[PDB]
Design a protein around this ligand. Structure first.
Ligand code: HEC
Ligand code: HEC
Ligand code: HEC
Ligand code: HEC
Ligand SMILES: [Ca+2]
Ligand SMILES: [Ca+2]
Ligand code: NA
Ligand code: NA
Ligand code: NA
Ligand code: NA
Lengths: 125, 376, 354, 125, 376, 357
């Protein structure tokens, strides 16, 4: 609740903005509109592009790379909105930049923002 | 008391610890069932709108559907499809208007038809469920037109095409009873029966006048198509019931949802979807509260449940929130759904005890309409 | 005995008695000084290898044997896709089924038949001793047993740490022993966020214990015919290499043109690249992928030739959903990916990069 | 504030939902988006249709008919939302029904709802 | 004392008592002036969006403009027009995508042009003012494209037509300095100068590298086209100033917006439009608060004001609210505008004293961007 | 003195000596027994009136003089529109300027000139006495003075309570002496919410002290030619009545075909309807407006003839923004409007409401 305090990750609830994998999410958590942690909701189109962050997992002490792939082709969900920016860099370093709509590669050319999934894609370093 | 977000956090952590792989993909919603419930958000007249598909039993959003300006949703009772009539413009809220009907697969939510309605014929009004309606075979969608005059549009869902507009009298709402027949409510206080063929003027028969001119029938009657029961409250909680099951209207004895003392002490129904009907229990549910007589669209904090045959009150629930709209699941041991427009929250209650079991928040900007399938 | 089987395979691996004129061993084409690939120049450069007869060339590039023991046996995975196996077209189930094939292929080691192989194994007193200890008396006298057992020994040897040491800079970075340079780290980040990750990482999500930078799936990325190699192989101007569709038991035409995703471990030192050796330089293999995404004219040109990349040998069944990512790699990202891919070089080959 | 209590008109602030001419307004007050009590905001289109209500003016004790005309062809303003229903009847009495989008007759056939004006059009009775 | 609602009530009551007749009509907004302020609401990535036109002097909404998905607004410094680049789809958020530029009359707010951009070329990103930009003659609009690669689209506003895409290096943002020249910011830490006043290929040249790899230049620098001054904060509140008035980039002495002691006590800039620049005063304004290093897009409660030539601190205002964006009017005794995304409110302050004078609430769902014209 | 002027006008108003053959007074065409309209039958029915010579027919319908005194003098209003004046085309600035005209019009009273009118006035000792008392000695021996004076007296007479009593049922209800019936009330509500109100109410907003159900502006609602009337007027089959554009000083072609909005007071009793008397029945005048809003085939048909309404006499400058309201009146609302408009009948004409209704 202090918005300026250092963000503190938890591994006990995926729908909260302090869930560990959401350390650089910007948008809405897909689990809250019928997707899951790592799948898109019905009717939306899964992008192949992403921004990335190194997120610390307080369950196991490891740092993982999360790929923030958007679910596209629907209006923004309006559920579980979150904006975290751990490590987040400006637009000229786009791989780490999260204001961008990472919808590229989605089916049917979908480029509207619905929500974001938080899959682990590799180890940080 | 483990929440769905906690359960998911544990399953994902187990998957990580086990080294389980899984392909990120697009989910399908679970099979439509009796406890699926749809919540439409007209968004206080915004140019775009949303529908939430909810698992009433889990209290989980399972999907959404985007819409345009004041869309009219429908749900096939057998669970085979859902649909809506919607309206968009070429530049947000300005420019060329397009009205259309979309039909969706209820598990993939993908559109399976997009059918243009020519000349922009929809009635644009705060959302009344029976201003757009499915025939009982599911093959035809009927929608209301107000301008230049009352009319009803016929859309062939199986052939995916608009057919034609039907001329009707000064009547309102659309309660289909057969593949080629529906009833409307007329300004004079009769119902009109409208039977239509592929061409020519439709057959229009009026019932007797069934209410006086100074008795006001609300915009949100409950209609069970499978029972052919229409349940129509007035502003005072007087309830009319019309049995259409024979194919012709027969008027049942009137019941009063409130006692003469409660009315004298200012109890009246109030809200949006103020009434629900459970077909198998033959029960009526009515949102009520103490209110001035011209505060009929405000929320209510109470629901009274009555036997539809005898009028006897079976329960009066303190809902514990400002409730605008109610509906029920049509299975045994039903859920009573109570939607707060102000909270943007669907509260999910045990219909027998009134007890709040769970809720679903963040349902858009001004959610108002709850729809369910009667699949039994 | 696991140890013993693999020690026997270690001897077979470098034994030229397994070739018809006794001029070549597994190690002639899979040279341990070159990450188990072929440094010999033939009619089509390093693109394809020359067999025991000194004349016959293959039609595919000799792949590394490094990390091949991590590839699962051929199967259909949980998503319904074909995965694993051996050879660029997966026609061998596993290493054991693969190992006898070069021995009998007239374009490679060229032994006439199994009996011929057995009779060479029998001529060596250490083999009678070593094989009989593991498989029983009489093993080398029955050509099918002898041949199977040699294959099993070879497969065992390839499963040893020598082939898969996990001591690249990447492995050292991931153990926390050092860090990526900034350029290498950029490259890593690009590799993981761009479409490379969809095919060149073992798992769709999560982390692999032993990452080898391939998902073991079959994809047609739309490569042209390598004309000098196709000529050298002699298969004809009308030949089509059908990839996975060449596997016996696969019949669906939709599998035509699809090849096994190679491990990118040691990629920097195992040029030339692709199943046909078509590209000499690692940068060129990277730039190929821009043909699907860049709007610039240069992206249609192979910089090694100054000419168009060429029509695909199999212009159907392309992996367009992965390949048409909507994003072009600029030169600075290409530089980054080259630097990252060099970190996948095993320690003993780091001197090959200077 | 108690929403169910009888509505009490005032004659001192037109931006509030208890201003006396708003006794059967449904939507948004135009004065809050660059219109005025009786004029539409720039870029919108003034309907010729209306629903009416008899609204009691506490300042002079008279009852006036207010014609609620919509300003159309913009998305809803989102400012000063109000919903009062003094004398408001169901849709089959449409002249007194205020869920209807009263945009008919607007220029360029505009039918989207932005806000509503509250002009006196006559005397009640 | 008297609010605008009260005054209007008083005026309306007098007109009625006097029997004044008046024609209901569509208003025109007042003439654009130095205290007009525009607030854009990207609505947290919603498919449709709004801009509010506000008289900063009265604190009054004077008009609105509808937009599509993540539109980019521009305002001609001379007050002659406003425009945006916007994006719509044929079925809300799905279907055929159309990108277009609209130009509006700043008093009627009617569109005077609607220019389609071929092949859906806009960069879709949370709203950065300098990702779409006017040339100082008002005849050209330049918009940024990211996919497949950094590029800049040229739109002729006079002839009302899209002209072409320009290929550029790996660079970001567009700062026009002449009718045929703009600058961009490159990954390598240089600026690129793009001279494009010909249908042929542009001339591209680079400046010196002016910042290292680990100094992060925010997404919302302030740029005064009339001064040619680009004011570019870092995450630590170090400020780069570049003077583009000669046509070539000159790099001005660096200034630190925060003291060493402040930076050791956790002070850092943060927000969205974190920085503003007043030209005639040559004054920089920076949103700062005590925060963790990676909470750089959170709101801030303080604004520091500093002299641009000397770096000397002129004030530190306690804003009294969670402020995401700032800007200033460009006239003599300027207003400091302070937009709260969370409150959906524009707080209007005296720039000299920092005191709150007035505020404008209900500015959409997540308002983020403030634009003014520099009419002097 | 105001009394005295009107009382003189009252005399002139029924005096047939102001017509050339002394057959005809103002009151012959503006008959007080018929809300000051012409009950007499002519070659075009009651569409147009016959003059003093017994055969010249006009080309326009004789309008009521009731409430004519509420109409402002011709001017341009604050919204920049022309408003007010007298005659269906506003060519007369006010009642004073109008009154002399029928006297000298050869198709009407047909006096040859002002001198001839002054001579008729002189012949009557009562006029010599009455006029001289108000205007001074010798007023009747100067033709222009006499003519102007007679016109002022008639204008004063028309401004008396007799012409504008405000005693219709509607006035009674608004005073709170009685209530509309349900149907009448429905007509009132429909009238004020539908397009009628944009033209047939004095004010754009607020409340009128003396409502006469017209804003006094000029509109082309796209009426056809009345064939039989046009025939009878002898103006010729290819004549075009240009409405307001016929006023001197109006030149703008945008004004062609526009006519002054008539007060709906006494409308139920002053049939036939419109500037050329084309429609016999009130219901039909109402239905005419449906041609611009209803989609159905029957809206194109004039129910009095069974054939299409006809093309507008003047096809340009139609008030389409007002007329094309997007809503069609059903038969219920037409009935309600008829019931409301009957309430606008002055008390003394209520017995005329039948006419079997
Ligand atoms: C050159 C004449 C070769 C000799 C001698 C041997 N190998 Fe080979 N190898 C060669 C080629 C051209 C290929 C690819 C051929 C194709 O059709 O795809 C191979 C492949 C293998 C593989 C599979 C590796 C993979 O798919 O990633 C294995 C395991 C293999 N080679 C092992 C092997 C052994 C054990 C040999 C001696 C018995 C042997 N190779 C000889 C070229 C040549
Ligand atoms: C699946 C659609 C793939 C994507 C996306 C990328 N690569 Fe790939 N790669 C793939 C296959 C099937 C093959 C073999 C193709 C053949 O028929 O020969 C490859 C090959 C490479 C190589 C050559 C390796 C070697 O010859 O030993 C390189 C260096 C390589 N790929 C790199 C790479 C990069 C950097 C990618 C992102 C830009 C990328 N690939 C995408 C399958 C796929
Ligand atoms: C029948 C032969 C008539 C006699 C005699 C008089 N009037 Fe008349 N009146 C007549 C017509 C056909 C018209 C409309 C003509 C046109 O061009 O519009 C009129 C009109 C008036 C008006 C105007 C009313 C209005 O515009 O609403 C007035 C005030 C008027 N008439 C008064 C009047 C007086 C005072 C007369 C005796 C001098 C008189 N009229 C005679 C038909 C005839
Ligand atoms: C302005 C655009 C108008 C609207 C809307 C309506 N009316 Fe009208 N009305 C108007 C004019 C200019 C005229 C005279 C037209 C002409 O050229 O003659 C009329 C006339 C009538 C009449 C006849 C009155 C008479 O002859 O004395 C009636 C009964 C009447 N109008 C009724 C009416 C109603 C009920 C409307 C709502 C449906 C309506 N009018 C609209 C101008 C306009
Ligand atoms: Ca190779
Ligand atoms: Ca008449
Ligand atoms: Na070659
Ligand atoms: Na095969
Ligand atoms: Na006629
Ligand atoms: Na004229």
């Amino acid at each position: 609740t202090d918005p300026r305090a250092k963000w503190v990750p938890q591994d006990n609830d995926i729908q909260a903005c302090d869930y560990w994998r959401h350390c650089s999410i910007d948008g809405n958590i897909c689990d809250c509109s019928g997707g899951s942690l790592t799948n898109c909701p019905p009717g939306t189109k899964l992008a192949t592009a992403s921004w990335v962050a190194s997120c610390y997992n307080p369950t196991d002490g490891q740092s993982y790379l999360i790929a923030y792939r958007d679910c596209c082709g629907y209006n923004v969900s309006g559920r579980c909105p979150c904006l975290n920016t751990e490590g987040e860099l400006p637009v000229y370093r786009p791989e780490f930049a999260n204001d961008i709509i990472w919808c590229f590669g989605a089916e049917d050319d979908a480029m509207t923002y619905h929500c974001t999934i938080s899959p682990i894609v590799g180890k940080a370093s | 008391q483990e929440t769905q977000g906690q359960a998911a956090a544990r399953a994902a952590a187990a998957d990580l610890a086990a080294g389980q792989d899984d392909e990120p993909r697009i989910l399908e919603a679970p099979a439509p069932d009796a406890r699926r419930v749809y919540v439409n958000d007209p968004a206080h007249f915004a140019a775009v709108t949303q529908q939430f598909v909810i698992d009433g039993e889990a209290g989980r959003v399972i999907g959404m559907i985007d819409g345009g300006f004041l869309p009219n949703p429908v749900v096939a009772d057998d669970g085979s499809f859902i649909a809506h009539a919607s309206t968009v413009f070429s530049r947000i809220a300005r420019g060329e208007r397009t009205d259309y009907v979309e039909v969706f697969d209820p598990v993939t939510l993908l559109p399976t038809a997009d059918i243009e309605l020519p000349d922009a014929p929809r009635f644009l009004v705060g959302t009344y469920p029976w201003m757009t309606s499915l025939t009982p075979d599911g093959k035809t969608l009927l929608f209301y037109q107000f301008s230049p005059a009352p009319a009803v549009g016929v859309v062939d869902l199986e052939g995916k095409a608009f057919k034609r507009m039907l001329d009707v009298p000064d009547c309102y709402h659309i309660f289909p009873t057969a593949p080629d027949t529906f009833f409307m409510h007329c300004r004079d206080g009769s119902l009109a029966k409208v039977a239509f063929g592929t061409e020519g003027t439709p057959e229009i028969t009026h019932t007797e006048v069934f209410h006086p001119e100074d008795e006001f029938l609300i915009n949100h009657p409950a209609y069970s198509q499978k029972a052919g029961r229409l349940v129509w409250p007035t502003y005072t909680g007087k309830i009319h019931q019309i049995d259409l099951s024979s194919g012709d209207a027969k008027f049942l004895p009137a019941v009063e949802a409130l006692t003469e003392a409660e009315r004298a002490d200012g109890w009246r129904p109030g809200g949006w979807q103020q009434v629900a009907y459970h077909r198998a229990l033959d029960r009526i549910y009515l949102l009520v509260d103490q209110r001035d007589e011209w505060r009929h669209k405000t929320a209510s904090r109470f629901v009274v449940v009555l036997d539809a045959k005898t009028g006897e009150r079976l329960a009066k629930f303190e809902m514990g929130h400002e409730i605008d709209s109610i509906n029920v699941s049509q299975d045994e041991k039903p859920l009573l759904y109570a939607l707060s427009t102000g909270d943007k929250t669907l509260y999910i209650h045990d219909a027998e005890s009134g007890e709040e079991l769970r809720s679903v928040n963040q349902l858009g900007h001004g959610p108002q309409v709850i729809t369910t399938a009667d699949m039994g | 005995a696991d140890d013993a089987l693999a020690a026997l395979g270690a001897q077979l691996f470098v034994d030229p008695a397994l070739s018809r004129n006794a001029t070549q061993s597994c190690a002639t084409c899979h040279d341990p000084a070159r990450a188990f690939t072929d440094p010999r120049e033939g009619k089509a450069g390093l693109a394809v290898s020359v067999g025991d007869d000194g004349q016959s060339h293959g039609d595919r590039n000799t792949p590394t044997l490094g990390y091949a023991a991590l590839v699962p046996a051929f199967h259909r995975d949980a998503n319904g896709k074909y995965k694993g196996g051996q050879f660029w077209d997966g026609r061998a189930d596993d290493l054991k089924q693969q190992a006898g094939q070069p021995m009998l292929n007239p374009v490679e080691m060229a032994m006439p038949d199994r009996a011929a192989v057995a009779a060479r194994l029998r001529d060596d007193p250490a083999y009678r001793t070593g094989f009989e200890a593991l498989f029983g008396k009489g093993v080398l006298d029955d050509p099918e047993r002898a041949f199977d057992a040699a294959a099993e020994a070879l497969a065992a040897y390839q499963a040893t740490g020598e082939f898969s040491p996990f001591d690249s800079k990447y492995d050292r970075v991931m153990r926390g022993e050092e860090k990526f340079t900034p350029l290498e780290e950029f490259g890593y980040t690009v590799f993981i966020t761009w479409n490379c990750r969809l095919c060149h990482m073992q798992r769709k999500q999560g982390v692999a214990e032993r990452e080898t930078f391939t998902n073991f799936e079959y994809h047609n990325i739309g490569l042209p015919v390598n004309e000098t190699a196709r000529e050298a192989s002699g298969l004809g101007a009308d030949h089509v290499d059908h990839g996975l569709l060449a596997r016996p038991g696969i019949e669906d035409p939709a599998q035509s043109g699809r090849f096994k995703v190679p491990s990118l471990r040691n990629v920097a030192v195992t040029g030339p690249y692709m199943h046909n050796g078509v590209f000499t330089d690692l940068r060129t293999a990277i730039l190929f992928y821009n043909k699907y995404t860049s709007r610039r004219p240069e992206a249609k040109i192979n910089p090694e030739t100054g000419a168009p990349w060429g029509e695909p040998e199999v212009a159907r069944n392309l992996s367009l959903a992965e390949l048409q990512s909507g994003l072009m790699l600029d030169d600075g990202r290409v530089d980054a990916l080259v630097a990252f891919l060099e970190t996948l070089t095993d320690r003993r080959y780091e001197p090959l990069l200077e």
